[PDB]
């Protein structure tokens, strides 16, 4: 009876547990993948896997998962949950009908495409560009990464990217600002961090919360929230004024540091200490300590950077520290990540093809009259990236121009975009709303025609290419065929492509055909890749590989320190002075924080019984003495009310002392209100629902989220169904 002493079929897969897309091996017995495993030869998983990757398979065998297309019952309100099962055909026609109506009445740009996941290549990067909408957005940009990608495109001329290029293994001194590794359970990162701990590397965690990474750190600086830039500037100052930086690195790969020294003149460990509350001496000491380990000291930039709203500044500053340690492109800090070669499918150019970072003529001198309408958020911040939370205003005020019709492919509208009431208002106002994705989550139910998408284990997805020391390519084969009336995303995009007359973009009938054509470029055929999984290519990692070659990697010529010209030229002062004291929480409030719980990947994993069993709810972290002053104890539940009065379902109180009195912390992604996701449904508190505000980063598209405050009201422990009882419902493959 055990899956392993029975029928097994083992495909090479790619984990859709999160976007790290670890290469895995999936072992199925019939139409049920029972175990998934990392595999060496895959630079991401190298035999290991994180908890989410191991439990990720459950969604496929989730009763609650979406099974057949659904069309909103005409006459019923988007809020309400009345749908009728449609045919894939009737659903696709209904969508193409509505989309063309909007197209022929408002233009293509009036349909916004929000997406996330591997399939978002179809629903965010290609299909909206074939259809001519510039309003395609991923939350991993303005709700995560945008400040660091903007900053990194300004400073080196490169992306930090998906699998960030930290040469963890040779690092001798690691400074983590935010970066709650161990909670953020991205697989290779954790392996690399563990390894570096093992090789004697010393870690300094800067974070107002004693988190898991701080638990492994040699120094924990419990920084006052929103104050990191002050710390970083004081580090730039100790590095420069005590003359500890790497001069020739500065001298040879840098342009413009004779501006950084003057800028940072007064940004002293004593100045920083006032704001930071980190003692001047510790500030000085850490600077000296990372210098002492120069080019094997790194301050790996964190991924989720959208805090407070002056975030590109914080990342710039931190990237300068790295430059000043002359660690970029050397062992011990950052290696140079090169994308792998894999030829795209041959097609005519797209109506719109964007540039993502490379600038000098960023947004203004690069979006205007050329295709047709500009991204609807075009003037709100300096960077050219589309900011997902900025495209939902047109949905309401119809201003810049009207956005009728929105696609939500594997992207949580009510958990991933701040200000849920606004998003809801925006949806009602839509002419069309589509929601493609696997389980039934609050935002999906609000759609006019839902589309169940074949689970990562049931579909073939266009190759995954990860820039890396060694550039590699991944291929996910379907372990077993879609279940129910479920379809793969490439297929949905193809149909919606043919239905909209974009057949020239989809000249390939099948994805195997599509994959083969691509594979052919690297004298390779599909079958062959199916036996390998991951095809790892060479790639240059160190500066010496570039230099001995006659070239340097960056933006404009070298690394611009404290530079980038067209910003200083027009639109905004150039450096990171914006330490800009964060607005502090009102009395009786805490500065909401949030993070990740190792077992859960954003909100899409709450209905997973395997994973919910490990962590059935989130818990609010408040300092012991604060909890004691309020009258809270360990058994208690509380409602978190934000500054705007929004209240979040009872959450357990965790007094336990790893946090400033200044703050409170909850893992992100709980508090679903989705009755059909029976397990996820009423558990924990949702930070996104309490994140009614955000401070927009004028530079990057960033929605600065840690700008919300929350108060605790005592609440009764909630009454909830037994999770084990729900976990036991058998999965009926129908």
């Amino acid at each position: 009876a055990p899956w392993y002493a029975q029928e097994v079929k083992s495909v090479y897969q790619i984990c859709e547990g999160c976007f790290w897309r670890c290469g895995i091996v999936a072992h199925a017995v019939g139409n049920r993948v029972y175990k998934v495993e990392g595999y060496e030869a895959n630079p991401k998983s190298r035999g290991r896997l994180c908890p989410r990757g191991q439990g990720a398979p459950q969604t496929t065998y989730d009763p609650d998962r979406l099974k057949r297309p659904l069309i909103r019952v005409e006459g019923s309100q988007r809020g309400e949950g009345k749908y009728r099962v449609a045919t894939w055909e009737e659903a696709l026609d209904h969508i193409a009908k509505k989309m063309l109506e909007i197209r022929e009445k408002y233009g293509p740009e009036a349909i916004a495409f929000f997406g996330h996941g591997t399939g978002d290549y179809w629903f965010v990067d290609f299909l909206p560009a074939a259809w001519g909408s510039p309003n395609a957005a991923k939350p991993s940009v303005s709700l995560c990464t945008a400040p660091r990608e903007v900053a990194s495109q300004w400073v080196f001329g490169r992306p930090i990217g998906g699998h960030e290029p930290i040469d963890w293994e040779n690092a001798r001194y690691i400074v983590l600002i935010g970066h709650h590794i161990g909670e953020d359970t991205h697989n290779t990162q954790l392996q690399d961090f563990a390894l570096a701990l093992k090789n004697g590397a010393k870690v300094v965690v800067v974070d107002p919360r004693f988190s898991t990474a701080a638990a492994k750190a040699h120094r924990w600086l419990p920084i006052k929230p929103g104050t990191d830039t002050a710390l970083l500037l004081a580090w730039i100052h100790v590095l420069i004024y005590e003359d500890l930086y790497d001069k020739e690195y500065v001298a040879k790969y840098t342009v413009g540091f004779e501006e950084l020294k003057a800028h940072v003149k007064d940004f002293t460990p004593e100045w920083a200490e006032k704001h930071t509350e980190i003692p001047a001496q510790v500030i000085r000491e850490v600077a000296r300590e990372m210098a002492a380990h120069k080019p094997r000291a790194v301050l790996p930039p964190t991924r989720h950077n959208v805090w407070y709203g002056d975030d590109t500044y914080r990342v710039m500053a931190l990237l300068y520290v790295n430059v000043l340690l002359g660690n970029y492109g050397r062992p011990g800090g950052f290696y140079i990540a090169q994308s792998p070669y894999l030829e795209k499918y041959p097609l005519p150019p797209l109506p719109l093809e964007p540039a993502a970072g490379g600038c000098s003529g960023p947004s203004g001198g690069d979006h205007e009259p050329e295709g047709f309408k500009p991204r609807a958020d075009k003037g709100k911040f300096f960077a050219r990236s589309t900011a997902i939370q900025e495209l939902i205003e047109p949905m309401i005020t119809g201003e810049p121009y009207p956005i009728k019709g929105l696609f939500a492919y594997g992207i949580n509208l009510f958990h991933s975009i701040p200000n849920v009431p606004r998003t809801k208002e925006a949806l009602k106002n839509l002419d069309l709303y589509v929601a493609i994705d696997v389980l039934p989550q609050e935002h999906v139910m609000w759609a006019d025609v839902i589309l169940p998408e074949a689970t990562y284990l049931e579909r073939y997805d266009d190759f995954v290419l990860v820039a890396h020391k060694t550039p590699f390519i991944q291929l996910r084969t379907p372990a077993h065929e879609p279940l129910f009336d479920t379809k793969p995303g490439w297929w949905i995009a193809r149909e919606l492509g043919l239905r909209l007359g974009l057949e020239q973009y989809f000249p390939w009938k099948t994805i195997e055909e599509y994959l083969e054509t691509r594979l052919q470029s690297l004298g390779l055929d599909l079958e062959t890749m199916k036996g390998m999984g991951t095809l790892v290519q060479r790639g240059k990692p160190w500066l010496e590989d570039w230099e001995k070659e006659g070239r340097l990697p960056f933006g404009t010529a070298s690394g611009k320190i404290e530079l980038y010209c067209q910003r200083f030229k027009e639109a905004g002062h150039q450096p990171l002075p914006v330490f800009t004291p964060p607005e502090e929480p009102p009395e009786g409030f805490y500065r909401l924080l949030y993070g990740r719980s190792p077992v859960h990947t954003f909100a899409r994993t709450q209905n997973n019984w395997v994973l919910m069993e490990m962590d059935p709810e989130n818990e609010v972290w408040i300092h012991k003495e604060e909890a004691k002053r309020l009258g809270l104890k360990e058994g208690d539940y509380v409602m978190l009310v934000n500054q705007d009065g929004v209240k979040e379902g009872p959450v357990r109180v965790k007094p336990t002392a790893r946090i400033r009195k200044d703050c409170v912390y909850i893992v992100h992604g709980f508090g679903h209100k989705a009755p059909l996701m029976r397990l996820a449904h009423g558990r924990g508190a949702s930070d996104n629902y309490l994140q009614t505000r955000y401070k927009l980063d004028p530079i990057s598209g960033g929605a600065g989220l840690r700008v919300n405050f929350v108060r605790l009201e005592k609440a009764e422990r909630p009454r909830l169904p037994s999770l084990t009882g729900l976990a036991k419902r058998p999965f009926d493959e129908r």
């Binding site: 055990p2 439990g55 359970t185 954790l190 790893r658």
Partner: protein, 193 residues
């Protein structure tokens, strides 16, 4: 003839629960029960905060109190030191659960007691346990204690400190926690309250 053991280097455990989830998938451990779980405890106060991430599971004690207590004989200790349950003889009386000091045992919904198995099914095919396999942090090792090339053996040797849960009990746990983060050793609830 070997002495099977597991070592967990707590200086590297971050308590992500990968091993725990890898276990559940592999052994298709049913909802509500766990062969492996993680315990996370803070030992506190700012300049001196310590968090211990500790995965717990059957320690396959060398002197298992859960074996002697079994009337049926379903609870047996193997020649290499695995405590296993033969469900054929199990009368699901719970005596072993009562005698297990670690809460490693549960009643399987199929009417017999279960618990971590040291991935017996894999050990025979010459593989390492699933939890050991998945571990991102490389903190858990396994092997035969007596073979000094064993990953457990080498780790025990490299450990700065080695601890075991409730040593005061008779058991001789064969799951060794290596570099315990708190100076006083493995965290206990009595040391809190």
């Amino acid at each position: 003839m070997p002495r099977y053991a597991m070592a967990i280097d707590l200086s590297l455990c971050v308590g992500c629960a990968a091993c725990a989830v890898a276990c559940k998938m592999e052994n298709e451990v049913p909802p509500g029960v766990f062969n492996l779980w993680i315990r996370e405890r803070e030992v506190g106060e700012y300049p001196n905060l310590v968090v211990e991430f500790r995965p717990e599971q059957c320690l396959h004690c060398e002197n298992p109190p859960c074996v002697p207590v079994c009337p049926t004989g379903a609870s047996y200790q193997t020649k290499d030191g695995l405590v296993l349950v033969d469900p054929k003889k199990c009368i699901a009386c719970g005596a072993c659960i009562a005698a297990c000091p670690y809460d490693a045992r549960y009643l399987h919904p199929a009417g017999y007691v279960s618990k971590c198995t040291f991935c017996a099914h894999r050990l025979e095919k010459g593989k390492v346990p699933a939890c050991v396999e998945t571990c991102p942090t490389y903190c858990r090792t396994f092997g035969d204690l007596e073979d000094p090339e064993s990953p457990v053996a080498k780790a025990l040797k490299a450990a700065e400190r080695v601890d075991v849960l409730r040593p005061e009990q008779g058991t001789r746990p064969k799951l060794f926690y290596l570099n315990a983060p708190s100076k006083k050793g493995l965290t206990r609830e009595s040391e809190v309250h």
